[model samples]
Target chain A: VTFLEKISERAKKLNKTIALPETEDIRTLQAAAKILERGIADIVLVGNEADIKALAGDLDLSKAKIVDPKTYEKKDEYINAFYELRKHKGITLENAAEIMSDYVYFAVMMAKLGEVDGVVSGAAHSSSDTLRPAVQIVKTAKGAALASAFFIISVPDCEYGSDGTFLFADSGMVEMPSVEDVANIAVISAKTFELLVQDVPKVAMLSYSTKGSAKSKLTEATIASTKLAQELAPDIAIDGELQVDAAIVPKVAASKAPGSPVAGKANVFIFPDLNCGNIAYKIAQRLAKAEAYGPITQGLAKPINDLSRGCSDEDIVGAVAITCVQAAAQDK
Target chain B: VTFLEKISERAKKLNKTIALPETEDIRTLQAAAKILERGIADIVLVGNEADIKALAGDLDLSKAKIVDPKTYEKKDEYINAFYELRKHKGITLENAAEIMSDYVYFAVMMAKLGEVDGVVSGAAHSSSDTLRPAVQIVKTAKGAALASAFFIISVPDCEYGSDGTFLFADSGMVEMPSVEDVANIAVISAKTFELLVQDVPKVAMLSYSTKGSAKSKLTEATIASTKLAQELAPDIAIDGELQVDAAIVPKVAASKAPGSPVAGKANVFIFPDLNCGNIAYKIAQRLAKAEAYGPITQGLAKPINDLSRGCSDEDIVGAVAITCVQAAAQD
Candidate 1:
């Protein structure tokens, strides 16, 4: 099957109840509702039920599952969470009780409490509103692992001659990550790669210097992170402290340093920091004519993904599908 | 005529006196003497003229003009200079005066004073001994600005399509030069290009970033230097902040960044630093099968050049001839 066809097939088996944060933007609601109608995924719309029903009528979002936040019998449980989080501040019980009424925050709490399988938002609201609620309600996975991001780069047939999807990690979530931090990033990247591609993922930690010529502490982190990946996921193919050309081009790999297993074949490229990852993927997407999607937050307490405020309908659909796929792995 | 043939022809016309240092390794003096015998240039062999003759005779020497430091009349000039430099170091005049009698320093002084046109040495002695005397005595030229080096890159017909030379500056001289430093380097490189290749030189200041996409203070400086050359030598063709391929390869130039004049036809490449110039010429020499000559020192008051300590007999002969070619421009 085609890659997109495979994605749609896998998604049909997932009885997904994706939570949307009361967004009226046609681009936002239409994509999720369409996925539900097409039997690709099911959406759980979170908002005032009357307003959602009216907006859906106009936007043709009939197949969407409209969940009213006001229907909850007890706001006390979610209100207590707000008070516990902001009690040190001048926030009183009254303000905390009122703040818990916010649909985005309340819906995120519902997902945290296992009311839904996954949540996707950040369409109508700011990045902080979409992420801060989840960050407070669902801090991270069991381990104290820091959050990271990735872009599933889809190169056109003209550029790379295949519909290959490669993961570029920590493109937006982290700032300057340390060696240990990159190790965490690599684990999440490898997990995402394996979960999505359905193959033993190979990861190459990229740097300006490869194989120790540019010797410095920051450069050694690539090598260190590569080693840590073997310890974390022994079955995963990982090697690094390599340059971009060394990791991607075969002849450069052959002449510069041969016998490299990861060179010319590594699809998952974990950059040193956000500067490298962000810039590298932007160049690949814009200049190299490849499709870049995400900064999908991994290592979170639950399967919650953030969308760029500038997101289109196509982006929202893809985000919804990816979150469901991630949720499926969590369910397993 | 071919470049070598032209050099031999020019060497015949000059009444040249090139000073080979007293303690120079014999191989260099032998090469210099061979060039002189072809009437390429006149030779001034400076040392204990007897021992020089003795060594020459021992090596079967025929072409030589030997000078004896022991019987020289300007003994007091060197002796006083010796004391003046070392007087504050608490050394006695006697000890200072005694060391001044060393032949290499005295011969270098003679060259600085126009007793000879060029000096070629360093076969036996260290680089410091060979160059330090020249730097101390000859000093720098007025508005000569920076003392830099060049490489005469001679690629074979198979590689370059022509056996002609390409020039590289600060190839061995400046370690880390500022933007303004390269402006002076470009001017001097332009002059060297003219001397060897006999044309108005087209200079391309090379960098990883081409034409401001690779932005830095250095990139600005490189562009500014190219403008500076336009002001100084309005007839010269120059451009800057071009990458290696953009400067050398035509198709790459056409595709990567077009409308650049220096791309595809740059005869002189001014590297941003020694790391680039040194590695670039070495890569051209070692990998691309190109013959590189020099560190031909420019911005000096006189036509003094240096050869690497790893130089062979042929290298010394070439350095001597280059020094001769350089001396013609000095006048």
Candidate 2:
């Protein structure tokens, strides 16, 4: 199936709720409209109703459900939610009252109270602004150690198939991740990759040194994280302390590490740090002519994806598809 | 050209004496015969004349030239060559004299004393036994900070174009190289790489981290060595603190480091240490189907190559071609 059709098929099964914080941005509004128009999601847009309606109308999105905080059904409930959530943070009653009146803040509060399934923001907003509000309201996943992002990549290689698609992680987020952070990233990425395949999976923890020649604390962290992940999922094939060549090339694996399961044929490659991960993905994208997707946030209570500012309309469609697959996989 | 033919063409040149030490083992004996029969090199097999001839005969190498130290023109001169060479190591005259009687040690002495051009040995010997006689007598490359080895990889992709071949350095000989050690290796690898191509050479310091996300002394060493190499060869294109993908894959290079000169497209890959180097080349050979030529010795005053114990006659012929190319390039 085409990527969109596969995702749309899953979206049909689980009608999820998603919140779009940007009501005025045409792209965000359009993406929200696409989600709702296809009946895949119930999208709640937060903005001035008239302004959003005008922009939506201009773009032929007259059917978009634009919610203004003043007319929201749970006005008192929203205020109570913020106070209860922020009471420990020392916000005064007046400050809490003022903050709760903001539609973006109220919409996040609504999501936190199970009124919405997920939030897709940060296109028209700064990352911290969009993510901080959601993080504060939705909290972290039940057993998640840290938050990371995963990118689904599309290349012309055999692994990418005719569509040239694959996945990468934590390229845009997680600076100076601890061992626990890497483990969390690995586990989430593994679970996500499992959705893409039919059988056992393999993960390669990328590093400059293969095993012990260049051993250090950072290498230890990567190796430990891989070990921890394997401990958590023993059935999965995994290897670490390898370079990109060992992970992607079959001969590289057999010769460099003859007994390694993930050497030269790793399906999942985890970079030791963000610098390497981000740089690798960017190089692949610009020079090798590969398409990249995500920075999809992991270790979340729900599937919440952040779109890059450069994302196109087709990218928006794909993101919704990814979110639907993620939601459905989590459901099972 | 076929590898054997390449060696034969260069063997007839002047000022080249290729020594085959430890002419004892059957494999070395067999290889020596091929080197002679193919005219791949003008070889000198050093050992006890009787034993050498016996092994050669057993291995069907009766035509090989045997250099018997006992029958030398100047026996005392040959003995003095080894005696004085090992004198400073607190060796007694008696032990030195006894060692000089041994053909492998004595022949190595001859090669060191301008009796031969380049030497190859180590099949019935440890790497130290094969190398120590030279280290003590020959010293090092004139002002060579150190000596290291590198692999000349000729993959299929490299057959039709420049990117198909690359130099991966310090696979053996150096263990846990410091920044200076790595810098020296890079210079040597770069020098070796230059012999094969005329393009503005791109050298990459291979590591796990690209631009310092992963931290450690080795990473620091790779970075420091890379910087040192630039100062050593400013005209050379070099970058590091990256893995193989970032160095060779253009898309990975662009996305990971958009403007790096070496990332995703490096020609000469300088591995941080031997572990990575050894593993990388083996993988490239086995998985990528790349042809790996040598752990050819570098940083020496003269080009000297070593053969693996597991090497075949074909391997020896290739080593001779490499030695000639190296000598020509160095000159």
Candidate 3:
């Protein structure tokens, strides 16, 4: 089966609760109906009652929960919780109440307060609007250093990579990451690769320089971070600094960097910086016409993911299913 | 016509003299015969007369000039000139004579003293062997600050960039160029684009960031260099710092940099450093399956081109033809 089909099947067994903040949008409601009918995640729509009900046309969302932040039973509890969490940032009780009234904040609080297993937003809002609360409230996962993102790229006719699906980390987050940040991203992304692909992660720390063929301070940092990542996660196969060709093409790998366990067979690509990660993925997406999924926020304390503003109903369904898988992993 | 065919046609009219140092290689001799037969250039084979003659079996090289550095009457004059040039670098008269005996050095000296219009080597030698003499002797063109290189990439089925032909600059030289270095490359490449493509050059300084959507010191350098390049060559159309998509895709340019003249229509792409240029070209060559020609040496005093050791006879002929065209332009 396809990767998405596999995800949907796995999600159905998880039976996790996923909350959508942009429930007023028709796409979100339609995705919610699909999620419910598919018997995957238990969907909850977070918006004003009249607004959500007015838009839930033809779609049977009766089994799905709808919560209005203004009249919810734990409104005071969530406000007090948020006020305490950000009181040091000058968030007064009234300010907290006002902020929680925004559905994104309310949805994140639900995840934090164990009311929902995950939060998926950004259908009708900017990434920061979806991510800000997740960053501030849900925060990083336990023992995780920072939050980052990855793209599960599915390139058709690709003979290399993880059967044509690869994990590219920090593609949309952590601009100009330091050595330590890259190592953390590598380790976290390895775990994420295992979660998504169910395969041993062979991570290639990508750079313009491969094995000192070119010299720069940037390349030296990549080399250093590769060592640091290997130290952090010894069981995972990792190598660097590799060029894209050396990382993917067997002939190039043999010629450029012989005897590297991860080279030419890497399923996970840890880009040196946001520039390369973002540009490389987009090149594969637009030029090679690869299917790029997620900037799925890894290292989050709870399972919270953001969607692109241009996402389709199918994309929403995929994000919801991915969040459900994360929720399942967290429970275990 | 295709770009290479066009180049061959232009080269035939130029009819300049180009020296091949690696005449011992059969491929070099074959390419010389083809280049001579096509009237692309007057081919001069530089080596021992006997050695070159022994390899000229079936190939019709009777029309080509053969010059042995050791036997040439002007050998002493070339030696004295090289000694004078390198005396400050700790070279002696004997050292100059020994170095001059090497055909690659001999070929470059031919270009230096204007005996041959240009030189093409590296069929069986490293790039440094071809480039080192050119860098140390021929040097940058008068008024040019630094030497650079470019590739004319012909990407098939490409919807953007110069109707499928694009000029990628500093692809094989200038490791980690400074802001001023990049500006110089940009300006020089714009002029190059005009010379080869014969169209008004629209230049784009490529970065991973497009119009400040992403921030870094690297992106800042690209942005600063774009302004510097624009200032340096105000007549050229130039913009940056653009991602590859914004630079080439009309839809992307509309969203990312709407007001920019060069965006979505840039024929010349100035890369940030050797890494991006080298890697980008290779990716286009290997993945996008584009035909990449010339890490053509630019900003040189005379046309002196280097070839990959794996180059075919056709590649050598192409290089010689390109060199002839470059020499013709110089004349």
Q: Candidate 2, residues A1-332: lDDT per residue as tens digits?
A: 45456667677677776667666678887777677677777677777787787777746555556677777787778777777878889977677878877666766776667767666766666556666666666666666346777666655334522234545657767755777777777777777777743234577776655665356655677688888877766767777777655666665566567788777566676766564565556545533445666667766666666676667765666676676667666562
Per-residue C-alpha lDDT of model 2 across residues B154-262, encoded as one tens digit per residue: 5553322144667777764564578888887887677677764444567888765777656765567778888998898787778878766677767667876679877
lDDT of each: 0.68, 0.66, 0.82
- Fnat per model, in the order given? 0.00, 0.03, 0.15
How well is each residue in A42-104 modelled by candidate 3, as lDDT tens digits? 987898777877888778998999899999999999999999999999889899989989998
Local accuracy of candidate 3 as per-residue lDDT tens digits, B1-331? 3677777888888768999999889999999888888888898899887887888888899999899998998999999988998989999999999988999888998999989999988778755567899987788888888888887777666666776778886766576788999999999888887887777888988876889886788778889999998899888899989887787788889998998888878778787776567556655554455666667898898989877554579878878877887786786
CAPRI quality band, candidate 3:
acceptable
- Candidate DockQ values, in order, are 0.04, 0.10, 0.30
The 10-residue segment of model 2 chain B with minimum total lDDT is B154-163
The model with the greater lDDT, 2 or 3, is 3
**Which interface RMSD values do the candidates have, in the order shown?**
11.8, 7.5, 3.0
Sort by DockQ, best first: what order? Answer: 3, 2, 1
TM-scores, all models, native as reference: 0.52, 0.65, 0.86
Count clashing residue pairs per candidate: 1, 32, 1
The true-versus-predicted C-alpha distance at residue B34 of model 1, in Å, is 35
Instruction: Write one digit per residue (lDDT tens) for candidate 1, span B1-331.
Output: 2344555676678667777764446776667666766677777777776666666654534566666666777677766775676688685889766666666777676777678888876656544466676776677888888788777776544222123467886766565677778887888788788877776577887664566654555456668877776677666777777765566667756866588767766678887665446545543443244555666788788877766544556666667777788888788
* lDDT per residue (tens digit) for residues A1-332 in model 1: 44445656777788767788756666767786678767877777777767766665656677776666567765677788777877887779998877777778877777777777778888788766777887777677564256777877775542221235678867666656777788778877777777876766667777644566455555566778778766776666677776555666556567544787676666787877653465455434532445666768887767788887778877787777788788877773
What is the alpha-carbon lDDT for the whole of candidate 2? 0.66
